[PDB]
Design a protein around this ligand. Sequence first.
Ligand SMILES: [Zn+2]
Length: 228
Amino acid sequence: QEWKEYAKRVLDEWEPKTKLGMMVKEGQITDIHEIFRRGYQIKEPEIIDVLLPEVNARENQEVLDIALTVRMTDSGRRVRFRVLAAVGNRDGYVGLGIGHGKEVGIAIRKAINYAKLNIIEIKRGCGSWECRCRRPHSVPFAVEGKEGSVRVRLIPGPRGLGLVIGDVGKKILRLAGVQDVWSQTFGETRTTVNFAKAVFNALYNTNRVAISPEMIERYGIVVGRAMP
RNA sequence: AUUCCGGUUGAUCCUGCCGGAGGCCACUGCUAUGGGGGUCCGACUAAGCCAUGCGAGUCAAGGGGGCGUCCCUUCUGGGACGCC
Ligand SMILES: [Zn+2]
């Protein structure tokens, strides 16, 4: 309910700037599932804040990396902060963002804003040989994701088995909603940005695999939010 | 738990190895209140060398004898009873 009044207040205070913003403010769009899979552009965070207001919860916002960066000038060293952050709701919507600033706080606000703009939609299910239930507690099937030199393979796992994946990967998966998965990684996983983006791509690729209608019943495939 | 993290740069991304983090076995510093179960305790170097004690005996219903007790007939000798 609190997030519902937050959405109401931001809707009252918000003036549209883009076509999608005007559409949402008018009311043609009322569910977050209606902004994806249409080719629209999301350049205004108010849409996310209104349709999926729970992403603003501190428990639902996570910062994955803070990196000091330096560039040389004849007058010395100019120092910048790069903050990699992840946001989303624990029901099938997640997003990852990178923000640059002169201070950690500025970088954090920019990164969270970009993550909100970059939010995506994923599909969950169960496809593990040892589990064979119909609940959306894991990834429906094995998926791949590559960024830089980091390759991440996510495999379904039985219920009760936690996230067998690096810390940042399990943080991203927890934000997305997944809670049981096995991992297989190659490359330099110590590069936090590349690893997080690889996990993001692996989660995103769940929509790039053709499935017959029977597979939905077999694996309990749920797109975006579930029975909630 | 089908996992990672630290380290080449003014800063970035790679390859590559080194180190942390787990289990098991052998020595070892500090320390120690109990009870049960087990197939643990001079294998790693010397299958090197050994004081002393013990670790393979049993059969009297296979045989002839010696010792001692008794019942004795009675110099003879018969029979039981054990021990050597
Ligand atoms: Zn399952």
